[PDB]
Amino acid sequence: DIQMTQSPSTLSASVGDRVTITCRASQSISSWLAWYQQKPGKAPKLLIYDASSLESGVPSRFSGSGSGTEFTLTISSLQPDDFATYYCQQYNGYPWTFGQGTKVEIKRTVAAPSVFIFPPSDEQLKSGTASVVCLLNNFYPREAKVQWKVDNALQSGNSQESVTEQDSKDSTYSLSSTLTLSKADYEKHKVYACEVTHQGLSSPVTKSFNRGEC
Amino acid sequence: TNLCPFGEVFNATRFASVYAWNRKRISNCVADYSVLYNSASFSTFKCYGVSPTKLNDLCFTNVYADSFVIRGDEVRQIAPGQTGNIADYNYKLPDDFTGCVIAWNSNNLDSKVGGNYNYLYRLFRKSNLKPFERDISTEIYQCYFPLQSYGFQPTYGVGYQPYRVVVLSFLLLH
Amino acid sequence: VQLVQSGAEVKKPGASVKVSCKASGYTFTTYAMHWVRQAPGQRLEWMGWINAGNGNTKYSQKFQGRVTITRDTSASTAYMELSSLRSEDTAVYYCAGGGGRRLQFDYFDYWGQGTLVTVSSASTKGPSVFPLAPSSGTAALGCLVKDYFPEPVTVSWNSGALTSGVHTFPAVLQSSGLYSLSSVVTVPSSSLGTQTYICNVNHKPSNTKVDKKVEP
Ligand SMILES: *[C@@H]1O[C@H](CO[C@@H]2O[C@@H](C)[C@@H](O)[C@@H](O)[C@@H]2O)[C@@H](O)[C@H](O)[C@H]1NC(C)=O
C-alpha cells in the first residue's frame, strides 16, 4: 500500500507568480503519476499524466516533472482560475492512492479579524441546550486559534468551528466557533469569553459576555 | 543532417499492446546501430539481414521500428516462421524478413502489484494474419470477447514477465 | 465524452446504495470506469473499476465483498453498489474513467458530476432557528440554524436584500447527529435601532420555512 504526501499543504500566491507544488511517495512509482485540479463543489480535472504528459487542452503553463520518488507540478505563470486544490495520484501500486492535496489560495496583505461573541438566546435556552458563538469576521491568513473560557476555565472538545471559502471581494476567510453545553452548565457559571490568536493581532484578543448581562 | 529518434522509441514511457502494436517510420536521418550493439541492456538482439555493422546511415532508404509488449516466453515468436498466438494473431514477420528483433525485460517498468491489465493480446482470429498485417478490432462474439490481459505482476516467472520488443525493418526501395 | 451520474441519495446504516453513471459520446466500446469517493474535506479514495468490454472488475481490498460494480452495456450505464454501510461511508461518489483509444486503467480522463451519499441514523427534520444579537462602530448580528437533518440549508437576509457583509458558514455535524451552522452579517451599529434585520431560512427537503427577526 503506497502513500503520497504533497509538500506545501497550502500556498498563497498572486496572479503571475511561478508556482510549484511537490508530491513525494513512500516507494518509487517510476513515472506512473497523474495530477488533478479540484474546485469546491466540482469534480476533479486531469492535468498531467505519466508525470509530464499534458492532458489535451489543459493550458501549457502546467508542467509535470520528476521520476521515481519525487515529483513536481510547476505553473509557469498563475491565472485567476488556477486557484484550486491540486492532487497527485500514483498508478504504480494497488489500491491507487492520492495525496492530501494543496489548496493554492490568493496571497493578500495581513488582515486581523473583528471578534464577536454571542450568548445563547433565551429562545434556545428553553430547550435544555445552550450554544455560545464566537465570530471571527473577515481575516487573513487562515492560521487562527480560538480558546473558549468559562469562568476562566479552559473549555476543550465541546466546541466546533467552520470556515468560509476565501471571500470573493477581499480574499479573506471567516470562522465561527461554537461552545455547546448543557443548560445547567450555562446557568451554573457567569463568565463566558473566547480568545482569538491571529497573525495580525500583536496580542491574543478576548471578547466576553456575562450571563444575563452581568 | 539531423538525428534519428530511436530514443523516442526505446526510451518511451509507454509501449503498445502487441495486438495493437506500434510502428514508427524512420525517414531521412542518421543514428548509430552499434550504440545498441554495445548497449547490452538487451536480452534479445537478433538480426536477419546483416550484422549491425554499417556505422552510418549506410545504404538505407526507410527504417520501420515496430514496438510492443508480449510476455517473456513469447519473444521466440518474433522471428521468421513462428506459429504461436502472437505470430498467428498479433504480429507476424515475413518469412524473408530482414531486420533485427530487439527485446529486453521490462518487469520493473510494466509489471504492477495487483497486475497491469493495460497490456493486451488477441486470442482467437478467424484466420492468421499476413505478415505486418494488423487487427485492432474489439468485436464480441456470439457472446465472448477476443482480447485477454497479461496482467503482469512482478512475482511472475521470467516466462510471464513483460518484455519490450523493438523490431527494425529495413526498406531499400528507391 | 460525457458522464452524468444519479442525483443524490441518503440511507440508514446497514442498508445499501446503488449509484448509476450513464456515459455518452464514448467513441469506442472498451474503456475503464472507476469509482472514487471523497469523504468530507478529505482525501480522494479509489475503490475499484470495471472493464467496459468483458465486464471484469478490480476492487480495492478496503471495500472487497462490500461493493459490486455492474456494467449495463445496452444502456451505456455503470452501476456501483456498496452494502452494509458503516457511516464511515458518507462521501461524494464520482465515477471516473478514460483512455479511450488506448486502454489504460491507470489515470482518470473524464469524471461524472459526483453523487453525494450520506450514512446516518437520522430521519429528515427541519431546523430550529435562533437569533444572534449584538452589543456595544461596526456591529455584528446573526441567525443560527440548529438541529436539522436534511442534506442542505440556505439562508438569506432581509428577503434577499442584504448581500454585502453576509457570511454563511459550512454546516457542522453534531454528536447528536444533526447538522447545525450559522449565518451572520456585519452592519453599522449607528443605524441599529432604525433598521430591522431578519434572516430568511429555508430548507426545502422538509418543506420548512423560517424567517427569524433579529434585534437587541
Ligand atoms: C536511453 O537512455 C539511456 C540511459 O542513459 C541516459 O538515459 C536518460 C535518463 C537520459 O538521461 C539520456 O540522455 C541518457 O543517455 C541511454 O544510454 C540510451 O542511449 C538511450 N537510448 C537511446 C535510443 O537514445
Side-chain angles (χ1 to χ4, degrees):
Chain A
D1 228 278
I2 4 272
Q3 184 120 42
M4 313 291 294
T5 125
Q6 331 171 216
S7 99
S9 239
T10 318
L11 205 163
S12 62
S14 293
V15 154
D17 272 350
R18 177 184 175 84
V19 174
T20 319
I21 329 137
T22 300
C23 183
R24 269 179 244 73
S26 1
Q27 317 180 10
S28 67
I29 53 162
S30 13
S31 263
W32 305 126
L33 184 56
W35 291 91
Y36 299 78
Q37 174 199 91
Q38 194 174 10
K39 298 186 165 208
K42 308 306 161 208
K45 164 175 71 167
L46 171 79
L47 293 151
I48 299 296
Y49 67 99
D50 301 350
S52 43
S53 279
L54 178 29
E55 170 70 335
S56 192
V58 167
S60 91
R61 52 187 202 257
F62 299 80
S63 17
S65 158
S67 75
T69 171
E70 193 163 40
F71 301 77
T72 62
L73 157 51
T74 270
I75 301 185
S76 67
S77 158
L78 193 86
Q79 314 299 93
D81 36 353
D82 300 324
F83 296 115
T85 283
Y86 292 49
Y87 302 100
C88 49
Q89 162 229 357
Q90 62 99 33
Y91 29 102
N92 189 23
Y94 255 127
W96 300 155
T97 58
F98 304 82
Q100 12 79 223
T102 287
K103 202 236 219 74
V104 221
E105 39 119 82
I106 307 171
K107 192 193 179 185
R108 178 218 199 290
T109 58
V110 161
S114 300
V115 188
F116 297 92
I117 171 78
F118 296 80
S121 61
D122 310 1
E123 185 177 317
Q124 171 193 18
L125 262 164
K126 316 308 184 180
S127 68
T129 298
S131 292
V132 193
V133 203
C134 176
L135 169 57
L136 283 61
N137 138 82
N138 281 265
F139 70 96
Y140 183 84
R142 163 72 153 281
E143 299 91 33
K145 174 178 189 188
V146 160
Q147 263 325 124
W148 284 100
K149 281 137 164 279
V150 170
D151 294 328
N152 280 312
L154 134 93
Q155 296 288 339
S156 28
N158 58 5
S159 49
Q160 330 180 37
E161 298 171 345
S162 148
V163 174
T164 62
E165 216 57 35
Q166 259 204 279
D167 162 86
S168 337
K169 217 285 187 298
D170 66 11
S171 324
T172 71
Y173 308 88
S174 308
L175 174 153
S176 79
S177 179
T178 342
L179 212 313
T180 353
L181 64 148
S182 95
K183 203 273 178 171
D185 271 315
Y186 176 79
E187 287 290 346
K188 288 204 263 82
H189 301 69
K190 163 189 179 193
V191 199
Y192 302 75
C194 61
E195 191 184 73
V196 173
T197 3
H198 185 253
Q199 250 218 221
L201 278 170
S202 75
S203 145
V205 174
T206 331
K207 278 264 182 309
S208 200
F209 89 91
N210 279 344
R211 166 171 48 81
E213 192 156 64
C214 182
Chain B
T1 46
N2 178 271
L3 234 160
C4 298
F6 291 142
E8 309 182 13
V9 192
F10 283 95
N11 286 341
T13 272
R14 282 186 196 241
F15 259 53
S17 285
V18 68
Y19 89 89
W21 49 279
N22 225 85
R23 134 83 56 78
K24 167 81 229 169
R25 157 162 46 106
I26 299 316
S27 32
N28 226 42
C29 55
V30 177
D32 184 56
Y33 347 88
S34 306
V35 159
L36 323 170
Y37 203 2
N38 296 16
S39 193
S41 26
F42 296 126
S43 72
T44 313
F45 198 112
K46 195 176 184 71
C47 302
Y48 293 67
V50 265
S51 185
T53 68
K54 290 86 50 192
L55 203 135
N56 292 137
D57 186 6
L58 231 64
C59 33
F60 274 130
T61 191
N62 242 215
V63 159
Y64 298 82
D66 302 307
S67 57
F68 47 74
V69 149
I70 65 190
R71 99 231 233 292
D73 282 347
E74 284 166 337
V75 162
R76 68 180 195 248
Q77 281 190 29
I78 305 310
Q82 306 317 315
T83 147
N85 279 5
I86 309 309
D88 291 0
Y89 313 142
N90 315 264
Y91 182 86
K92 166 54 119 290
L93 288 185
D95 282 20
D96 52 359
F97 183 53
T98 63
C100 298
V101 171
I102 308 167
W104 53 275
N105 183 301
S106 75
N107 190 35
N108 284 328
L109 261 119
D110 306 290
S111 61
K112 285 192 183 329
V113 179
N116 183 345
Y117 292 84
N118 289 337
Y119 286 110
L120 287 195
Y121 70 104
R122 184 178 301 285
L123 187 41
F124 185 65
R125 190 167 200 283
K126 278 291 189 176
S127 62
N128 289 12
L129 302 165
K130 267 82 198 83
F132 297 126
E133 149 150 89
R134 183 161 157 185
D135 189 345
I136 66 195
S137 151
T138 43
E139 305 253 328
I140 295 156
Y141 226 83
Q142 267 183 358
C143 313
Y144 315 105
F145 205 91
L147 294 177
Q148 265 212 321
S149 187
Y150 289 101
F152 298 118
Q153 32 210 62
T155 33
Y156 288 173
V158 293
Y160 282 73
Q161 300 170 5
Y163 272 72
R164 260 143 182 250
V165 178
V166 176
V167 177
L168 301 187
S169 274
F170 289 85
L171 267 200
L172 236 186
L173 42 95
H174 218 147
Chain C
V1 209
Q2 187 82 67
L3 290 123
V4 169
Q5 315 186 188
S6 47
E9 272 131 316
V10 47
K11 275 196 146 308
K12 309 176 176 178
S16 318
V17 58
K18 204 175 180 186
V19 166
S20 64
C21 163
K22 188 167 196 167
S24 60
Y26 241 142
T27 151
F28 294 91
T29 48
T30 351
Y31 46 83
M33 273 288 312
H34 317 252
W35 286 92
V36 3
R37 75 185 172 164
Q38 201 153 44
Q42 245 232 4
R43 255 201 254 255
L44 275 175
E45 265 191 46
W46 175 89
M47 305 172 74
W49 56 234
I50 193 167
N51 192 343
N54 41 32
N56 295 347
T57 59
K58 188 52 165 325
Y59 296 160
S60 179
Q61 183 118 356
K62 181 175 173 76
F63 321 90
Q64 185 92 20
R66 268 166 49 88
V67 83
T68 286
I69 296 184
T70 346
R71 166 237 52 202
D72 181 2
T73 173
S74 306
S76 221
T77 323
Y79 294 89
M80 190 273 277
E81 179 243 40
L82 185 57
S83 48
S84 299
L85 307 129
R86 66 199 25 159
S87 178
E88 181 200 331
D89 291 304
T90 303
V92 167
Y93 284 89
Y94 306 94
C95 52
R101 159 232 150 165
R102 269 178 152 191
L103 248 265
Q104 46 81 7
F105 308 84
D106 287 7
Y107 60 102
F108 317 97
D109 278 296
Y110 321 104
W111 294 76
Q113 99 248 11
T115 288
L116 177 143
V117 163
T118 324
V119 201
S120 166
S121 317
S123 213
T124 327
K125 75 177 291 173
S128 186
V129 171
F130 304 113
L132 293 194
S135 79
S136 78
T138 294
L141 69 310
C143 260
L144 153 60
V145 185
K146 180 147 182 306
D147 300 316
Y148 75 81
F149 181 63
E151 6 191 3
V153 291
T154 70
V155 183
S156 74
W157 280 96
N158 259 82
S159 320
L162 189 41
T163 63
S164 54
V166 149
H167 276 333
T168 305
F169 285 85
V172 109
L173 173 54
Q174 287 168 122
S175 68
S176 82
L178 303 184
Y179 305 149
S180 172
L181 61 82
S182 296
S183 162
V184 297
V185 55
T186 48
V187 304
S189 60
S190 2
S191 62
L192 261 180
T194 55
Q195 178 54 31
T196 304
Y197 307 92
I198 301 149
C199 94
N200 332 93
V201 182
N202 183 230
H203 133 38
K204 310 188 88 65
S206 84
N207 269 83
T208 323
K209 52 148 296 197
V210 268
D211 16 270
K212 192 64 78 180
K213 193 119 66 72
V214 179
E215 290 163 18

